[PDB]
Structure 1
Amino acid sequence: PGVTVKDVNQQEFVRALAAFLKKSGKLKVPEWVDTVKLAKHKELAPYDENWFYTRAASTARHLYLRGGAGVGSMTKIYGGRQRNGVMPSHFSRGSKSVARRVLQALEGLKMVEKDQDGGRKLTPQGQRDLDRIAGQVAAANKK
């Protein structure tokens, strides 16, 4: 009964990946994580303290689902609805430095490597880590 990440609920899966990434802390967390907004269209800083671990976990999961995603692509995933105040709402993109630094911390953890073409994808041991955490979260959800 092998377990991939596609057989587990991605929500508590990414939460468990963030928890593991927290407890085995080897990240290059930038010094301005307590200040910046995660995107242009946000109006408050993220409520959670160590949101960097959760965002890195989400990027790792997205890179597992499809490779070759660059920084501009990750801004597309983490873009949202800008309310623009009194003018009608629109769509905005995620923070480019946030996405870049999350990716750079990921190859600092060497679970992500750049492609021969643009963008970056997962490494075999990064895939192994994702699958292992998926298996353990499936086991926890069952029992």
Structure 2
Amino acid sequence: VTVKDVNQQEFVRALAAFLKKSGKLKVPEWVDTVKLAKHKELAPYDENWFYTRAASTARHLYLRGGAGVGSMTKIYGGRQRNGVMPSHFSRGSKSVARRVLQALEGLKMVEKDQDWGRKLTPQGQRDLDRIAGQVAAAKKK
């Protein structure tokens, strides 16, 4: 495995947990309260979820040259039920993603990229690749 080698769900699942063990990520004190998207029906069932998003994003950046919060809000953004009106896109929160981006920096997984947008760092690139291997290794099944 390149991270590209591992399936997205298991990769994210494994990394997100690894982050949880590490114990040092950092977390707008909120996270108990927050929905994550105006579109959103209820907050996240796994109140633990902050880690999962972080993993998801780290993987998301590693794939691509550089990304920023607006893109993430939309990615997270689902369809919002206008009620009487037909449903439409609504890019998902900007505080969570930003905080995610800021926090990741602390670990050095990602760093400000040139010309705007955060890019993965070689430190992160190394870190993701390492867990990617661990996941591949676990088993067949």
1:65-111 deviation line (CA, Å, top 9, x unaligned): 11310111111221111112222111110101111100001001111
**Identity within the alignment, %:** 99
Aligned residue pair count: 141
C-alpha contact (below 8 Å) 2:37/2:91 kept by paired residues: yes
For 2:126 and 2:61, the matched residues in 1 are separated by 13
Give 4+ residue runs of structure 1 displaced > 6 Å after superposition.
none
C-alpha contact (below 8 Å) 2:25/2:103 kept by paired residues: yes
Shift of 1:6: 1.0
Shift of 1:63: 0.2
For 2:111 and 2:96, the matched residues in 1 are separated by 18
Q: Which moved more, 1:78-87 or 1:53-62?
A: 78-87
For 1:8 and 1:33, the matched residues in 2 are separated by 29
Shift of 1:7: 1.1
1:20-56 deviation line (CA, Å, top 9, x unaligned): 0000011111111000111110020100021100000
Q: Is 1:76 matched up with 2:107?
A: no
Residue 5 of structure 2 corresponds to: 7
Q: Structure 1: which 5+ residue stretches go unaligned?
A: none
For 1:114 and 1:38, the matched residues in 2 are separated by 23
Task: Give the 3-state SS of the residue equivalent to 2:79 in structure 1.
Answer: strand
Q: Structure 2: which 5+ residue stretches go unaligned?
A: none
For 1:58 and 1:132, the matched residues in 2 are separated by 16
For 1:67 and 1:76, the matched residues in 2 are separated by 18
Task: Give the 3-state SS of the residue equivalent to 1:142 in structure 2.
Answer: coil
For 1:111 and 1:57, the matched residues in 2 are separated by 10
1:103-143 deviation line (CA, Å, top 9, x unaligned): 00100111110012101101111011100111110011328
CA RMSD of aligned residues (A): 1.1
